[PDB]
Amino acid sequence: NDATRISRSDFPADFIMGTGSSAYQIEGGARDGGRGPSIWDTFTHRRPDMIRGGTNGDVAVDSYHLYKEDVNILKNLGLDAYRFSISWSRVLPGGRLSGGVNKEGINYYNNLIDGLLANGIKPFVTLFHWDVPQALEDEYGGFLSPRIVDDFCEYAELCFWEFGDRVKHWMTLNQPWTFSVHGYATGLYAPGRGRSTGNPGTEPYWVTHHLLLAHAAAVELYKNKFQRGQEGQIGISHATQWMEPWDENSASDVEAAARALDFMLGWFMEPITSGDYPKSMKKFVGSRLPKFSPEQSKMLKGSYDFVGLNYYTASYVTNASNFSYNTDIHVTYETDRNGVPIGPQSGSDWLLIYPEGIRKILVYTKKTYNVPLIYVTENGVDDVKNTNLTLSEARKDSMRLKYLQDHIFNVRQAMNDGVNVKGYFAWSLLDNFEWGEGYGVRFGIIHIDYNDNFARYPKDSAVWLMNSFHK
């Protein structure tokens, strides 16, 4: 009943604790070991103006060469599991089979997986984290085109065949919302489209449409071809953010909030639930929103063994007043009620600390979509920016410590409220590359010294997690 005392014994024996990362944010080795370029290589190299400080992830924090050390950090940490993604163009440098299979890349992921297991850490592997192979992008528009479904399936298949004997927990995509929206609506993330040159009214909906089909075809492939031999499970992971009615009463705000949810989580959750987009979306986007063949619907319906959700912050929503995903939602976001922000800021101004959000979003998801099995796949906060601190100052991440305590507590509540959560993954393991943000933002429970070969050192949060949750 007091969050600072929360610990492993407040959870069922089989509950899974872990941490995570994605390939491009940590691996480096961009051009080592036969890896091909991804759209994020091109984006950061051709448009350095789009990145704080003009940096990229050629080297990142060099987990590609330092992975034996990360594994050792994970062993000392004590948690059950580690979540990471595979770099598509490291194993298939030309994206599709005819561009060559990269043995060295396969060999890297085998080494990582063997190391995790030799140490009793269970791997959760995500197939895709926005790093589309540049060659598929240049050949046919990547996820714009539906050719991407077949290529994606060849890739998924390669992975199950090589790693499936050991990896028993797969996810097809992570955060597809973010890919679709900032890739094609705002143009702020690779491939940087839409303000032809792009179109925020249309492309985001095709891209999301192709994402979902790719997800579904891969899940079917796994279920029909691998599941019986390998006995693992497959799932997917979604961006979420709690939507709160600016005015508790105005049932017009209650609507705005519920619409904001549809356009973020329903956009992906409805189709794998009933095989169709949500009415709210069909209503306000109308004919710009693609439809599913009925065999497509039949294939998307129930396409998952579990769902993971990533949660960070929350917002107030109210109603609003050529075409564009953003304007299509017809909402405005507010941060305060009468001068009071929904929660304090972290180091980042888009991130307001609101622990109750995670309990809500979890309950809302079980209620609205009826998922039988959930993982919190990402959750965390960033240090305040300050290049002026020596290590012993830098590593005292009180705010992060409290932020994890509070959110893990709320996860525990949601379980009492009947939501079946099988685990929680803190984000992230290492300070790393943060996309448009470059290296200026630190999300890690492990500190990275950029001045001295990416030296790893544990923050207080890390030690707290090991002590409270070791096993």
76 binds, among ligand DH8, a copy of itself, Cl ion, none (CB under 5 to 8 A by kind): a copy of itself
- Minimum Å distance from CB 308 to a copy of itself? 26
For residue 43, CA distances in Å to 54, 183, 297 come to 11, 11, 34
Task: Looking at residues 300 to 319 of the shown chain, list those that interact with a copy of itself (rule: CB under 8 A).
Answer: none
Question: Is position 54 an interface residue for a copy of itself (rule: CB under 8 A)?
Answer: yes
The residue from 229, 302, 344, 372 that contacts a copy of itself (CB under 8 A) is: 229
CA–CA distance, 292 with 281 (Å, rounded to integer): 14
Contact (Cβ atoms closer than 8 angstroms) between residue 58 and residue 463: no
Kindly indicate which of the ranges 10-18, 24-32, 294-302, 338-346 contains the residues binding a copy of itself, using the contact rule CB under 8 A. Answer: 24-32
Task: Give the interface size with Cl ion as a residue count (CB under 5 A).
Answer: 5
Could you tell me the two tokens for 459? 């923050």
Beta-carbon count within 10 A of 282 CB = 15
Residue 256 C-beta-side C-alpha neighbours within 13 Å? 23
For residue 440, CA distances in Å to 51, 52, 68, 422, 469 come to 10, 8, 25, 33, 29
Question: Is position 316 an interface residue for ligand DH8 (rule: CB under 6 A)?
Answer: no
Could you tell me the two tokens for 265? 């989580």
Contacts 24+ apart (CB under 8 A), 414-421: 414/358, 414/359, 414/362, 414/363, 417/359, 417/363, 418/366, 419/362, 419/363, 419/365, 419/366, 419/374, 420/366, 420/372, 420/373, 420/374, 421/362, 421/374, 421/375, 421/376
Q: Which is nearer to a copy of itself, 161 or 323 (CB)?
A: 161
Question: Is position 168 an interface residue for a copy of itself (rule: CB under 8 A)?
Answer: no
Question: Is position 128 an interface residue for ligand DH8 (rule: CB under 6 A)?
Answer: no
- Minimum Å distance from CB 311 to ligand DH8? 7
Q: Which is nearer to ligand DH8, 303 or 310 (CB)?
A: 310
Question: Is position 434 an interface residue for ligand DH8 (rule: CB under 6 A)?
Answer: yes
Q: Which is nearer to ligand DH8, 312 or 325 (CB)?
A: 312
Question: Is position 241 an interface residue for ligand DH8 (rule: CB under 6 A)?
Answer: yes
| Positions that interact with a copy of itself (CB under 8 A) | 7, 30-32, 34, 37, 45-46, 48-49, 53-56, 58-59, 75-76, 78, 93-94, 96-103, 134-135, 138-139, 150, 154, 157, 161-162, 164-165, 225-230, 387-392, 395, 451-453, 455, 457-458, 463-464, 466-468, 470
